[PDB]
């Protein structure tokens, strides 16, 4: 993975030695070159993973997450260069260095062969994200939101540290390749009960679990646009990646430990979706929709069937692209009206027709329109949870009504109706903004032509 | 103070710690602690205000009580063993008295009650000596008597130090009291792993001394003793805010920093010995230390508190203070985790 | 540095270079007392280094190229706007007075640095011991608030305690009438707006507070405006003073070494001038502070430490 | 009153000083080169050649092989009368059982 780690590190002298008018264009160019090189991870086999070294490997789970991670950095640079145009030059370079450092932590989070190196990178991803939210967020509440984002994660994850070192002492290793072959059945006990909780609650916070999700509609709202893109597109998927690695070690106890959490997600995706019906803050509406979509990934991991893991990784990649595009659209209005209130600027299809087409496509992929990979992941999780219990389709289908209802109401409030009369600074869409929308949406629609690369280790 | 007298007194502080470290007789241990206290009292009274006299009086009383309990532990060892070798003690009463004496000399809770006062009463350099150099001699004596230290006593001292040093710094605005409660919590972390693996005790001591010396060197280089005067640093020297940011994130044990290195290794040595609840509650209580570190980073680096007009005059002068080893200690307190297996040099 | 503990160890004592002529003399008086020639006259009779009265741009004169900076970088205050609108809403009165106290503190540090490094006495004009006489004269006229007086007393309490008083204070007895006569003969259109009660408050805090508290810690010489015209009488009075008061008597090499270490570190001199008391007349918010600081970095010769500026022609930077 | 503060700056319009602005920068040459870099290295390079790369992957996770291999095995055992799939994955001769 060192062919991806060293170019990401060389982005640091690339961004600190550039000319002052050149520090966006060079980083965008070479991050796009790294994302072009990211397709060499697709050397995946039907039997074996692509095992690079003692430290790094990549199966078909980490590979779409790595391509999405290396693809999201140029899009974050495009999104975050307008509102940081008036910024000091050294602080602008520090912002770009925090995004580069976060990508550098993420690409060896997803490729960590050993689980405590996974933990170290997985918790190293806090510090650039925390600094970005609490330094380049706009409002007052970013300090409090950074505290919530920090201390839900660490309160969930410092038990995970003790649990991983306990597995290290018991099994002798935390190599995932060794633990594929040395995994022992985890019997029913209270010791193994709190073992399961210490392995799972950090990722339950990262997904987020409903009830633990309170950090998210602050940390995804009080952040700048690049922070919201990396949080909702990648950093919610560290939890699903970690669960799909760690439930190997937690059998057969998971088969009854999952029952409360599944309820917390199956009811949670009813509640949070319903919350999106009555949100005034558009960025908070996208945040509670993110909680609603990640509840399905929690259910699909906790029922641990093949169709569920395929649908869960498809839904994670699809939700990454979709929610990142939705945050970028909310920023495209917020750079014009300077308020995140959704009822403020209405009827924007009368003024921005192509941007309203981007809103339409993002909302149709949000409501899981076939044959988008949003619907592929949605539908496969629905199939596997129907095999889990035939009643859950009700809680699925009612969700699939409300998921439609907030996706179009967001379209109806922002883009339709009569426009707001007193707002007259609605500029035409810049080429940068439509470029960002197309670089979100065109990969998302091209993946419908060949979805087997985003279906994970057991396609 | 005369610089020659200052040099001779600081060499006498060092000589007291050395005589504790290198001697094989308990009387010379007690003599080294006496020499250390006797020489460090004028370092605390360097500026001659009533706060330094109060701090030196409180320091004298606690260290004198600890020295007398130390000598009673030594004398009881002489009762029950007839000899004087600095090794395990031959009576649990002498072990308890010596563990109490060294917990007083380290200022571990519930004998912590002098550490935030005395550190507030003295200058920043003498506070640096008190919070770094004055740990080395009692931790050496604890290193040599660990076959006789009671487990329950030293673990009670450890968890009580971690919890009290956690909750103490949450109410503070003075930087010296913040560093003092940080000291109490870190000494709890160092003695919680003493009977399990003393190499990780030495590791935590070295990483703590590096991070503490970095923070006191930054506080001296910016002449800052309160939070609210540290908040003017971005308008005076914007590099120092980045330095206190990375060093306060390192003292909280956030990976990939070096201060994640000890406590992780401490957990790594406490689960081998089948203690799971204890390092878990220790690591959960370390979030309090992290919280007031995050409070300081919000006040200093990640936001910009308003400054005054006279700061514009201080823009026209560069810092002529000798920032001794400050880039070295900044690097060694942040970027050291990829060199974590270097700890075998402490075995 | 140049001087430190090692130079004190290696034999540089300051009582070696401390002759009888090494006297710190501060010349005081009202706004047009005409003392400025007298001070210079004393400095050309005794071989003393004269320091002019510190305005806004004293720190600008000591640093960089020595030329005055624009007013947004230094001061953020105008003397002429205080002359025009003393009760102005923008808080320019106490902001000007606090910047003047900082400038006089820097000047007094330079005075003690010269006196302790060379042994040549220094003539000052209105040192930090005689700055509050303007402040009270503003406060008695309602030009500042009581919070400004409390802030000044805090900064003065933690700054003037670190230093020694002058050896000689020379005061010039001038009535308010002669002050206004010399103001009207001066021609400054702003300075003629000074009220008579302001000058009367200046003279009352002079004769009521300053000289009665400085007669114990040093030697006052109080001349009238016509006998201050003869410099040789004043210098002959100075040369026959029996110095018996003030803490200049009990100064060994150790205390004056500590004082010389203080006055050569300018950011420690100016440490507690900017204490974080949030007073609206001096508090600069974060956006203005960031903007003015980033503009100050872009001034020529001001981006780096002084010997490290390519743009003003510093060489051998890769070997420094 | 309140402290010495800069007033709220206006939001800038990149179309006033530059009606052909692409939204990247206020310098027009920098703006147009940022546009060309994003559109070439994003669309012409990563999207087009990336979809060409994904479209022509060498039998991604060997599914095609597994069809053709299956087309061997059925064709082997349609002839020999063997059942097309055994219910036992492993040979029962090489399995010891726990007796009772």
């Amino acid at each position: 993975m060192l062919k991806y780690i060293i170019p990401t590190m060389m982005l640091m002298p690339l961004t600190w030695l550039s000319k002052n008018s050149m520090i966006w264009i060079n980083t965008t160019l070479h991050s796009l070159l790294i994302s072009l090189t990211s397709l060499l991870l697709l050397n995946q086999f039907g039997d074996n993973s692509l095992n690079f070294s003692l430290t790094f490997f990549s199966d078909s789970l980490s590979t779409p997450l790595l391509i999405l991670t290396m693809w999201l950095l140029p899009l974050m640079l495009m999104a975050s260069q307008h509102h940081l145009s008036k910024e000091n030059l050294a602080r602008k370079k520090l912002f770009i260095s925090m995004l580069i450092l976060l990508q550098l932590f993420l690409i060896m989070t997803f490729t960590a062969t050993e689980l405590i190196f996974f933990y170290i990178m997985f918790e190293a991803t806090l510090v650039p994200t925390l600094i970005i939210i609490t330094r380049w967020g706009n409002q007052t509440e970013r300090l409090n939101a950074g505290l919530y984002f920090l201390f839900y994660t660490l309160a969930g994850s410092l038990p995970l540290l003790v649990a991983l070192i306990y597995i290290q002492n018991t099994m002798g290793s935390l190599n995932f390749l060794i633990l594929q072959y040395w995994v022992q059945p985890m019997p029913n006990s209270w010791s193994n009960t709190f073992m399961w909780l210490a392995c799972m609650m950090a990722f339950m916070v990262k997904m987020p679990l409903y009830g633990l999700h309170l950090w998210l509609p602050k940390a995804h709202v009080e952040a700048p646009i690049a922070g919201s893109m990396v949080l909702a597109a990648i950093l919610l998927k560290l939890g699903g990646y970690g669960m799909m690695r760690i439930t190997l070690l937690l059998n057969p106890i998971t088969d009854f430990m999952a029952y409360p959490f599944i309820m917390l997600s199956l009811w949670g995706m009813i509640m949070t979706s319903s919350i999106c019906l009555r949100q005034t803050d558009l960025k908070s509406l996208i945040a509670y929709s993110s909680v609603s979509h990640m509840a399905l990934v929690i259910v699909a991991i906790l029922i641990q069937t093949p169709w569920s893991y395929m649908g869960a990784t498809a839904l994670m990649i699809a939700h990454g692209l979709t929610s990142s595009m939705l945050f970028c659209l909310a920023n495209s209005n917020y750079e014009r009206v300077h308020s995140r209130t959704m009822i403020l600027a209405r009827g924007l299809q009368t003024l921005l027709p192509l941007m309203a087409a981007w809103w339409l496509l993002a909302s149709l992929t949000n409501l899981a329109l076939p044959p988008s990979i949003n619907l592929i992941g949605e539908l496969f999780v629905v199939m596997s949870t129907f095999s889990w219990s035939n009643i859950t389709i009700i809680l699925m289908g009612l969700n699939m009504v409300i998921t439609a209802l907030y996706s179009l109401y967001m379209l109806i409030t922002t883009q339709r109706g009569k426009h707001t009369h007193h707002i007259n600074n609605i500029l035409p869409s810049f080429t940068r903004e439509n470029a960002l929308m197309s670089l979100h949406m065109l990969p998302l629609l091209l993946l419908s032509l060949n979805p087997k690369i985003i279906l994970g280790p057991l396609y | 103070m005369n610089p020659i007298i200052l040099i001779i007194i600081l060499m006498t502080v060092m000589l007291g710690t050395i005589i504790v470290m290198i001697s094989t007789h308990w009387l010379l241990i007690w003599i080294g602690f006496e020499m250390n206290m006797l020489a460090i009292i004028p370092i605390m009274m360097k500026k001659h205000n009533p706060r330094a006299t109060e701090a030196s009086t409180k320091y004298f009383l606690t260290q004198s009580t600890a020295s007398m309990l130390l000598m009673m532990a030594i004398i009881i060892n002489l009762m029950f063993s007839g000899q004087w070798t600095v090794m395990k003690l031959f009576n649990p009463m002498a072990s308890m008295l010596m563990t109490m004496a060294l917990a007083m000399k380290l200022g571990m809770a519930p004998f912590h009650f002098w550490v935030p006062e005395v550190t507030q009463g003295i200058p920043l350099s003498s506070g640096l000596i008190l919070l770094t150099w004055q740990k080395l001699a009692p931790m050496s004596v604890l290193y040599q008597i660990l076959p006789s230290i009671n487990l329950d006593l030293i673990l009670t001292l450890s968890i009580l130090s971690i919890t009290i040093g956690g909750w103490g710094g949450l109410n503070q605005t003075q930087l010296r009291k913040i560093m003092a409660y940080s000291s109490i919590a870190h000494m709890g972390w160092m003695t919680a792993v003493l009977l399990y693996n003393p190499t990780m005790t030495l590791l935590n001591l070295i990483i703590y001394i590096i991070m503490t010396s970095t923070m006191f060197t930054l506080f001296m280089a910016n002449s800052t003793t309160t939070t609210l005067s540290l908040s003017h640093t971005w308008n005076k020297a914007p590099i120092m805010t980045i330095l206190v940011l990375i060093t306060l994130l390192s003292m909280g044990g956030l990976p990939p920093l070096s201060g994640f290195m000890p406590k992780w290794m401490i957990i790594q040595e406490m689960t081998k010995n089948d203690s799971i609840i204890l390092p878990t509650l220790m690591a959960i209580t370390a979030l309090l230390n992290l919280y007031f570190y995050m409070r300081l980073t919000y006040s200093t680096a990640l936001t910009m508190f308003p400054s005054t007009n006279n700061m514009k005059m201080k823009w026209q002068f560069p810092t002529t203070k000798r920032m001794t080893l400050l880039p070295t200690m900044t690097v060694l307190s942040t970027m050291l985790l990829p060199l974590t297996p270097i700890l075998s040099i402490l075995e | 540095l140049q001087y430190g503990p090692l130079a004190y160890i290696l034999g540089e004592k300051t009582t070696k270079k401390m002759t009888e002529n090494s006297k710190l003399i501060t010349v005081d008086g009202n706004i047009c007392s005409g003392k400025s020639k007298l001070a210079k006259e004393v400095a050309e009779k005794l071989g003393l280094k004269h320091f002019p009265e510190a305005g806004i741009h004293y720190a600008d004169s000591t640093t960089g190229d020595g030329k005055p900076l624009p007013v947004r970088f230094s001061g953020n205050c105008s003397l002429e706007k205080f002359y025009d609108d003393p009760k102005s809403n923008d808080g320019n009165s106490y902001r000007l007075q606090a910047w003047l106290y900082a400038s006089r503190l820097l000047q007094y540090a330079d005075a003690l640095e010269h006196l302790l490094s060379t042994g040549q006495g220094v003539v000052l004009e209105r040192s930090i011991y005689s700055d509050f006489v303007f402040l009270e004269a503003m406060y008695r006229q309602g030009f500042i608030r009581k919070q400004c007086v409390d802030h000044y007393n805090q900064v003065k309490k933690v700054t003037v305690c670190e230093y020694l008083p002058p050896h000689v204070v020379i005061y010039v007895d001038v009535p308010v009438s002669e002050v206004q006569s010399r103001i009207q003969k001066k021609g400054n259109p702003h300075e003629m707006k000074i009220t008579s009660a302001y000058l009367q408050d200046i003279e009352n805090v002079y004769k009521g507070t300053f000289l009665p508290e400085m007669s114990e810690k040093c030697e006052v010489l109080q001349y009238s405006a016509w006998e201050a015209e003869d410099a040789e009488k004043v210098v002959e009075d100075i040369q026959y003073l029996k110095y018996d008061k003030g803490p200049w008597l009990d100064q060994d090499d150790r205390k004056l070494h500590n004082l010389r270490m203080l006055v050569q570190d300018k950011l420690e001199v100016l440490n507690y001038t900017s204490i974080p008391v949030f007073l609206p007349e001096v508090t600069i918010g974060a956006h203005q502070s960031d903007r003015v600081f980033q503009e100050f970095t872009e001034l020529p010769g001001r981006k780096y430490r002084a010997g490290y500026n390519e743009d003003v022609g510093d060489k051998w930077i890769w070997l420094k | 009153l309140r402290w010495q503060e800069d007033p709220e700056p206006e939001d800038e319009n990149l179309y006033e000083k530059n009606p052909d602005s692409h939204g990247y920068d206020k310098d027009p040459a920098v703006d147009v080169w940022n546009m060309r870099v994003v559109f070439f290295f994003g669309f012409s390079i990563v999207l087009v050649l990336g979809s060409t790369f994904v479209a022509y992957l060498p039998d991604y996770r060997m599914q095609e092989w597994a069809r053709r291999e299956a087309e061997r095995l059925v064709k082997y055992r349609e002839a020999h009368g063997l059942p097309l799939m055994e219910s036992n994955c492993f040979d029962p001769s090489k399995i010891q059982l726990p007796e009772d």
Partner: peptide
């Protein structure tokens, strides 16, 4: 429109004898 930076009321919360 610009970034919120702390005011005097925010800053005085960190300037007491205790927090």
């Amino acid at each position: 429109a610009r970034q919120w930076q702390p005011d005097v009321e925010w800053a005085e919360q960190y300037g007491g004898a205790v927090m």
